């Protein structure tokens, strides 16, 4: 799947537009994790 | 072959762009 460019089905654990390439998903996934990291940083230092 | 080398670079670049560790939230009595 990676060499052909299609996103592996074991990584799509959230809704994505139909026909997204793996490169776009990887960039989108990185941004989502960065938001989660910022949320985790704020929650750890600052409470709820 | 050639596909091994180009995929190795692509996977290595992806590992760099993708963040490494994501820390879990700490549960507290008022947090829950």
From Swiss-Prot, chain A:
Source species of the chain: Homo sapiens (Human)
Known disease link: Charcot-Marie-Tooth disease, axonal, type 2O: An axonal form of Charcot-Marie-Tooth disease, a disorder of the peripheral nervous system, characterized by progressive weakness and atrophy, initially of the peroneal muscles and later of the distal muscles of the arms. Charcot-Marie-Tooth disease is classified in two main groups on the basis of electrophysiologic properties and histopathology: primary peripheral demyelinating neuropathies (designated CMT1 when they are dominantly inherited) and primary peripheral axonal neuropathies (CMT2). Cortical dysplasia, complex, with other brain malformations 13: An autosomal dominant disorder characterized by global developmental delay with impaired intellectual development. Some patients show signs of peripheral neuropathy, such as abnormal gait and hyporeflexia. CDCBM13 is associated with variable neuronal migration defects resulting in cortical malformations.
Cysteines engaged in disulfide bonds, as pairs: none
Residue numbers of the full-length protein present here: 4454 to 4501 of 4646
Subunit (UniProt): Homodimer. The cytoplasmic dynein 1 complex consists of two catalytic heavy chains (HCs) and a number of non-catalytic subunits presented by intermediate chains (ICs), light intermediate chains (LICs) and light chains (LCs); the composition seems to vary in respect to the IC, LIC and LC composition. The heavy chain homodimer serves as a scaffold for the probable homodimeric assembly of the respective non-catalytic subunits. The ICs and LICs bind directly to the HC dimer and dynein LCs assemble on the IC dimer. Interacts with DYNC1LI1; DYNC1LI1 and DYNC1LI2 bind mutually exclusive to DYNC1H1.
Compartmental location: Cytoplasm, Cytoskeleton
Protein family according to the UniProt entry: Belongs to the dynein heavy chain family.
Protein name in the entry: Cytoplasmic dynein 1 heavy chain 1
Record comment regarding domains: Dynein heavy chains probably consist of an N-terminal stem (which binds cargo and interacts with other dynein components), and the head or motor domain. The motor contains six tandemly-linked AAA domains in the head, which form a ring. A stalk-like structure (formed by two of the coiled coil domains) protrudes between AAA 4 and AAA 5 and terminates in a microtubule-binding site. A seventh domain may also contribute to this ring; it is not clear whether the N-terminus or the C-terminus forms this extra domain.
Organism lineage string: Eukaryota, Metazoa, Chordata, Craniata, Vertebrata
Swiss-Prot record, chain B:
Domain-level remarks: Dynein heavy chains probably consist of an N-terminal stem (which binds cargo and interacts with other dynein components), and the head or motor domain. The motor contains six tandemly-linked AAA domains in the head, which form a ring. A stalk-like structure (formed by two of the coiled coil domains) protrudes between AAA 4 and AAA 5 and terminates in a microtubule-binding site. A seventh domain may also contribute to this ring; it is not clear whether the N-terminus or the C-terminus forms this extra domain.
Taxonomic superkingdom: Eukaryota
Localization per record: Cytoplasm, Cytoskeleton
Name this polypeptide is given: Cytoplasmic dynein 1 heavy chain 1
Disease: Charcot-Marie-Tooth disease, axonal, type 2O: An axonal form of Charcot-Marie-Tooth disease, a disorder of the peripheral nervous system, characterized by progressive weakness and atrophy, initially of the peroneal muscles and later of the distal muscles of the arms. Charcot-Marie-Tooth disease is classified in two main groups on the basis of electrophysiologic properties and histopathology: primary peripheral demyelinating neuropathies (designated CMT1 when they are dominantly inherited) and primary peripheral axonal neuropathies (CMT2).
Endpoints of the signal sequence: none
Quaternary structure note: Homodimer. The cytoplasmic dynein 1 complex consists of two catalytic heavy chains (HCs) and a number of non-catalytic subunits presented by intermediate chains (ICs), light intermediate chains (LICs) and light chains (LCs); the composition seems to vary in respect to the IC, LIC and LC composition. The heavy chain homodimer serves as a scaffold for the probable homodimeric assembly of the respective non-catalytic subunits. The ICs and LICs bind directly to the HC dimer and dynein LCs assemble on the IC dimer. Interacts with DYNC1LI1; DYNC1LI1 and DYNC1LI2 bind mutually exclusive to DYNC1H1.
Task of the protein: Cytoplasmic dynein 1 acts as a motor for the intracellular retrograde motility of vesicles and organelles along microtubules. Dynein has ATPase activity; the force-producing power stroke is thought to occur on release of ADP. Plays a role in mitotic spindle assembly and metaphase plate congression.
Residues of the full protein shown: 4374 to 4405 of 4646
Family: Belongs to the dynein heavy chain family.
């Amino acid at each position: 799947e990676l060499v052909k460019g299609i996103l592996p089905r074991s990584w799509s654990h959230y809704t994505v537009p139909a026909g997204m390439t793996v490169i776009q998903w990887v960039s989108d996934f990185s941004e989502r994790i960065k938001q989660l990291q910022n949320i985790s940083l704020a929650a750890a230092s600052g409470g709820a | 072959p050639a596909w091994m080398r180009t995929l190795h670079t692509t996977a290595s670049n992806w590992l760099h762009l993708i963040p490494q560790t994501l820390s879990h939230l700490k549960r507290t009595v008022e947090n829950i």
